[PDB]
Amino acid sequence: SRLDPPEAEVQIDRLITGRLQSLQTYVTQQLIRAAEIRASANLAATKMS
Amino acid sequence: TNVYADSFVIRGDEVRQIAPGQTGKIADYNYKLPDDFTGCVIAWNSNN
Protein backbone atom coordinates (compact mmCIF):
# COMPACT_ATOMS: atom_id res chain seq x y z
CA SER A 1 0.00 0.00 0.00
CA ARG A 2 2.78 2.44 0.91
CA LEU A 3 4.68 1.96 -2.37
CA ASP A 4 3.83 2.67 -6.09
CA PRO A 5 4.52 0.06 -8.79
CA PRO A 6 8.25 0.68 -9.58
CA GLU A 7 9.93 0.63 -6.19
CA ALA A 8 7.14 -1.47 -4.74
CA GLU A 9 8.26 -3.91 -7.43
CA VAL A 10 11.96 -3.74 -6.58
CA GLN A 11 11.46 -3.92 -2.81
CA ILE A 12 8.92 -6.75 -3.07
CA ASP A 13 11.41 -8.51 -5.34
CA ARG A 14 14.07 -8.24 -2.64
CA LEU A 15 11.55 -9.46 -0.07
CA ILE A 16 10.37 -12.37 -2.22
CA THR A 17 13.98 -13.38 -2.84
CA GLY A 18 14.41 -13.32 0.93
CA ARG A 19 11.27 -15.37 1.55
CA LEU A 20 12.25 -17.76 -1.24
CA GLN A 21 15.64 -18.20 0.41
CA SER A 22 13.94 -18.79 3.76
CA LEU A 23 11.42 -21.26 2.35
CA GLN A 24 14.06 -23.03 0.25
CA THR A 25 16.33 -23.37 3.28
CA TYR A 26 13.33 -24.68 5.20
CA VAL A 27 12.50 -27.16 2.43
CA THR A 28 16.10 -28.34 1.98
CA GLN A 29 16.77 -28.64 5.71
CA GLN A 30 13.43 -30.41 6.08
CA LEU A 31 14.38 -32.74 3.23
CA ILE A 32 17.59 -33.53 5.11
CA ARG A 33 15.60 -34.03 8.32
CA ALA A 34 13.10 -36.11 6.34
CA ALA A 35 15.97 -38.26 5.10
CA GLU A 36 17.06 -38.65 8.73
CA ILE A 37 13.46 -39.44 9.70
CA ARG A 38 13.21 -41.86 6.76
CA ALA A 39 16.39 -43.62 7.86
CA SER A 40 14.92 -43.86 11.35
CA ALA A 41 11.64 -45.10 9.83
CA ASN A 42 13.44 -47.76 7.80
CA LEU A 43 15.19 -48.70 11.04
CA ALA A 44 11.80 -48.81 12.78
CA ALA A 45 10.34 -51.01 10.03
CA THR A 46 13.44 -53.20 10.21
CA LYS A 47 12.93 -53.59 13.96
CA MET A 48 9.24 -54.29 13.33
CA SER A 49 10.12 -56.98 10.80
CA THR B 1 8.27 -7.60 -35.46
CA ASN B 2 6.56 -4.20 -35.26
CA VAL B 3 7.36 -0.66 -34.12
CA TYR B 4 4.95 1.94 -32.74
CA ALA B 5 6.32 5.45 -32.14
CA ASP B 6 4.16 7.12 -29.51
CA SER B 7 4.19 10.91 -29.79
CA PHE B 8 2.99 13.50 -27.28
CA VAL B 9 4.16 16.45 -25.19
CA ILE B 10 4.68 17.06 -21.48
CA ARG B 11 6.17 19.76 -19.28
CA GLY B 12 9.86 19.93 -18.47
CA ASP B 13 9.01 18.54 -15.07
CA GLU B 14 7.13 15.23 -14.74
CA VAL B 15 9.21 13.85 -17.62
CA ARG B 16 10.16 11.03 -15.23
CA GLN B 17 6.48 10.05 -15.29
CA ILE B 18 7.20 8.65 -18.79
CA ALA B 19 8.44 5.39 -17.29
CA PRO B 20 6.93 2.01 -16.36
CA GLY B 21 4.93 2.46 -13.17
CA GLN B 22 6.17 5.96 -12.33
CA THR B 23 3.25 7.77 -10.70
CA GLY B 24 1.94 11.28 -11.35
CA LYS B 25 -1.21 12.94 -12.65
CA ILE B 26 -0.15 12.54 -16.29
CA ALA B 27 0.68 8.88 -15.66
CA ASP B 28 -2.48 8.41 -13.57
CA TYR B 29 -4.94 9.79 -16.13
CA ASN B 30 -3.29 10.82 -19.40
CA TYR B 31 -0.71 8.22 -20.45
CA LYS B 32 0.48 5.17 -18.50
CA LEU B 33 3.31 3.06 -19.89
CA PRO B 34 2.97 -0.67 -19.16
CA ASP B 35 5.01 -2.14 -16.34
CA ASP B 36 6.81 -4.45 -18.79
CA PHE B 37 7.72 -1.63 -21.16
CA THR B 38 10.38 -2.21 -23.82
CA GLY B 39 11.69 0.69 -25.88
CA CYS B 40 13.56 3.98 -25.96
CA VAL B 41 12.32 7.33 -24.65
CA ILE B 42 13.64 10.49 -26.32
CA ALA B 43 12.71 13.74 -24.56
CA TRP B 44 14.52 15.84 -27.15
CA ASN B 45 14.60 19.55 -26.43
CA SER B 46 11.62 21.68 -27.48
CA ASN B 47 11.97 25.17 -26.05
CA ASN B 48 11.18 26.43 -29.56
Which technique was used to obtain these atomic coordinates? cryo-EM
Identify the residue among B16, B17, B18, B22 best suited for mutation to test binding to A, counting A beta carbons within 10 A and taking the highest.
Answer: B22
Distance from CA of A5 to the nearest CA of B (A): 5
| Contacts for B3-7: CB closer than 8 Å, 24+ residues apart | B6/B31
* Beta carbons within 10 angstroms of residue B21's beta carbon: 19
Mutation choice for B interface testing from A1, A2, A3, A4 by most B CBs within 10 A: A4
How far is residue A14's CA from residue A6's CA, in Å, rounded to a whole number?
13
Distances (CA, A) of A33 to A7, A24, B15, B17, B37: 38, 14, 55, 51, 45
